[PDB]
């Protein structure tokens, strides 16, 4: 690892600088180096890791969607043959995206998840595992597509089971997990009714627990609740 010679604390410091500079590829490389030091990550460090890779893969997903749309149009009736270039370049971006997802999944498997015992860490990492398998599923078309989808489902389900046992219904990690698993149902698993049911039940159970929260916790929880409502409005 090219970060092997840099101190853990320096990698974290530079990840924060990279974020300020909107250098998310650098941020992700610094956080990968920090993970590879072998120590567990604090709450703040877990969120630096997730912010970095979410931004990187988010840009790759946006680019893949642009290219996939151009490719689809090139394959419509009446479209002029333009050669292999669109497919080739879509494949190049897709392969890079898969590489990023494989890198994140590799960090989770070696060895973040196995050392994560508290609900706030374990649910967070299992949510990430579901998310990155979901991004792989978005571009999957081959023999293993069903297994990729099932890997996402399994990770989300384990995270859900822990979150319901160990966290209050307003916990922002629990809420964001439910938001994303609901999107998995709608967009990946062809299960819009499950997606809607999950979003609605999550929202309603969070609403009922808001009375227990401080002003700052209330702000955090209601922010994610509004995203659940936004998706429900989109879907109904």
């Amino acid at each position: 690892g090219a970060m092997g010679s840099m101190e853990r604390a320096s990698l974290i410091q530079k990840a924060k600088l990279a974020e300020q500079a909107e250098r998310y590829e650098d941020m992700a490389a610094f956080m990968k180096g920090a993970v590879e030091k072998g120590e567990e990550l604090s709450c703040e460090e877990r969120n630096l890791l997730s912010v970095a890779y979410k931004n990187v893969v988010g840009g790759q997903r946006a680019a893949w969607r642009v290219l996939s749309s151009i490719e689809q149009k090139s394959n419509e009736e009446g479209s002029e043959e333009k050669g292999p270039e669109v497919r080739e370049y879509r494949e190049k971006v897709e392969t890079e995206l898969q590489g990023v997802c494989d890198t994140v999944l590799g960090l989770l498997d070696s060895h973040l998840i196995k050392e994560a015992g508290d609900a706030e860490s374990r649910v967070f990492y299992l949510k990430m595992k579901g998310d990155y398998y979901r991004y792989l599923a978005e571009v999957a078309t081959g023999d293993d597509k069903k297994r990729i989808i099932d890997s996402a489902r399994s990770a989300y389900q384990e995270a859900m089971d822990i979150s319901k046992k160990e966290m209050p219904p307003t916990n922002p990690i629990r809420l964001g997990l439910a938001l994303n698993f609901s999107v998995f149902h709608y967009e990946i698993a062809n299960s819009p009714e499950e997606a809607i049911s999950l979003a609605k039940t999550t929202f309603d159970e969070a609403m009922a627990d808001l009375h227990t929260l401080s002003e700052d916790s209330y702000k955090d929880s209601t922010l994610i609740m509004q995203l659940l409502r936004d998706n429900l409005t989109l879907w109904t």
């Binding site: 998310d131 964001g176 995203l227 936004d230 989109l234």
Partner: peptide, 5 residues
């Protein structure tokens, strides 16, 4: 696209 976090 729908919202995720």
């Amino acid at each position: 696209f729908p919202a995720t976090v």
